[PDB]
Design a protein around this ligand. Structure first.
Ligand SMILES: O=C(O)c1ccc(Nc2c(-c3ccccc3)nc3cc(-c4ccccc4)ccn23)cc1C(=O)O
Length: 437
């Protein structure tokens, strides 16, 4: 694999569907490196559980938890960590209202080098048990020799871009990790970093983050093909924000416009959004409790019923994961027959203005509320014009492992989007229960 894109292990599926999947215990194993220290960026943590995922011999190495919690939530996280004197905390500043620290990333410093893991799972048992989640594993980055002056930079600029992402926190604990990254050679990295950080970005900074960062990378490092208008956009996510009273407010004006960019020159493009139906959740491995990790409120949904006409069912026969509800987020640009893709992104970013950014000030400023992080696979970074789509996820350097089924299937007339804070009492789930929140 040039791509090093993995799914998490799913408990209960046949072993053939976990061959080449990774559990957190595999990622932290001594086989991956001799751990010196680590940073865990995430949203939600079960600290007792997390420490148990490290090998016993590594459980007292320093761990930094990077989170966004405030007030009582912050106090609860500190109380979780206080029995472990090797655990330090970094509170990411969230100075714009209604923002979240969503980024899921591990920085793993070893005796042998450095590894970066950008993934989609919270650090709690449920997120690694029976969900569909995505993982990108960096190479083992060697240390640059003392006194050697080299950039250690990749053709995708990943080293400087990761440092730039960390610099936005303005945090002393992350400056130490910046200095660690400076000392390592990341030149083998073949993905582009796409982050979101909170702020109001104008001028050149406009292109640093969010959907303008995606747009810039697609303009600079992809090429437009004939009939590009027929290549769909696919977005796939676990949470839905308030997008406005109609599709022209944001979804099909600035968001789609960024997503359909290819090349440097200058819309009928089909837009497929994949999000679990109520039936998807009810019949899932977890049952209705899977919907506790699919946050879409009735208050949000009832103001944008227009959106649900874009919604397609979760289906993942290709990876044996149709009943493993998605907490991965992915965006990609398939060909009209879905046999090829022009790019693929795995990220923390859900379908929300908070995550991707919303233009302000007459289109001159991009406002982002949250921290998000993903990695972009572009054919040009692999010496290719496009990626073939892998037919069976677990069945090579030209063939990208898309983890769910194509083409996506539209909701039926009786399907509804999973909405997490209303009851479902008409048909029981796989554990025999109803949903009464
Ligand atoms: O599906 C994901 O990816 C995901 C989705 C939501 C996540 N947090 C979260 C939760 C929550 C609470 C308890 C259990 C799970 C989630 N409630 C909110 C509410 C808001 C909000 C936004 C605008 C205005 C008012 C409120 C924003 C974030 N909220 C976290 C994730 C994640 O896994 O990182």
């Amino acid at each position: 694999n040039p791509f090093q894109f993995y799914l998490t292990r799913v408990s209960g599926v046949k072993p053939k569907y976990n061959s080449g999947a990774l559990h957190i215990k595999d990622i932290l194993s001594p086989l991956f490196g001799t751990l010196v220290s680590s940073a865990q960026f995430n949203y939600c943590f079960d600290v007792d559980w997390l420490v148990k995922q490290y090998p016993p011999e590594f459980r007292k190495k320093p761990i930094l938890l990077v989170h966004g919690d405030k007030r009582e939530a912050k106090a609860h996280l500190h109380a979780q960590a206080k029995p472990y004197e090797n655990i330090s905390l970094c509170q990411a500043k969230l100075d714009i209202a209604f923002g979240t620290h969503h980024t899921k990333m591990m920085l793993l410093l070893y005796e042998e080098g450095l590894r970066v893991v950008i993934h989609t799972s919270n650090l709690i048992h449920a997120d690694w048990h029976q969900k569909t989640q995505g993982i990108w594993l960096s190479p083992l980055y060697p240390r640059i020799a003392d006194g050697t002056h080299k950039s250690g930079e990749s053709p995708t600029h990943f080293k400087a871009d990761l440092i730039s992402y960390l610099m936005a926190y303005n945090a002393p604990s992350l400056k130490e990790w910046i200095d660690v990254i400076h000392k390592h050679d990341l030149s083998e990295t073949n993905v582009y970093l796409i982050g979101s950080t909170p702020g109001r970005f104008q001028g050149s900074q406009k292109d640093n983050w969010g959907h303008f960062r995606l747009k810039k990378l697609l303009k600079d490092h992809a090429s437009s093909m004939p009939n590009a208008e027929s290549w769909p956009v696919v977005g796939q996510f676990s949470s839905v924000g308030s997008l406005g009273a109609d599709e022209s407010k944001w979804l099909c004006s600035e968001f789609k416009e960024s997503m359909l960019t290819l090349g440097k020159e200058s819309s009928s493009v089909p837009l497929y959004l994949i999000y679990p139906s109520v039936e998807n959740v009810r019949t899932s491995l977890e049952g209705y409790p899977a919907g506790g990790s699919l946050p879409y409120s009735i208050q949000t949904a009832e103001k944008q019923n227009w959106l649900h006409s874009y919604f397609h069912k979760w289906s993942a026969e290709t990876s044996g994961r149709s009943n493993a509800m998605p907490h991965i987020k992915t965006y990609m640009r398939p060909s009209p027959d879905f046999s090829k893709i022009a790019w693929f992104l795995v990220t923390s970013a859900n379908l929300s203005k908070a995550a991707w950014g919303a233009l302000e000030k007459n289109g001159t400023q991009l406002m982002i509320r949250s921290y998000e992080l993903g990695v972009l696979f572009l054919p040009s970074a692999f010496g290719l014009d496009s990626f073939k789509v892998k037919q069976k996820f677990f069945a090579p350097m030209a063939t990208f492992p898309v983890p769910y089924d194509l083409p996506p299937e539209l909701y039926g007339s009786k399907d509804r989007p999973w909405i997490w804070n209303i009851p479902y009492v008409k048909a029981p789930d796989t554990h025999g229960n109803m949903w009464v929140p």
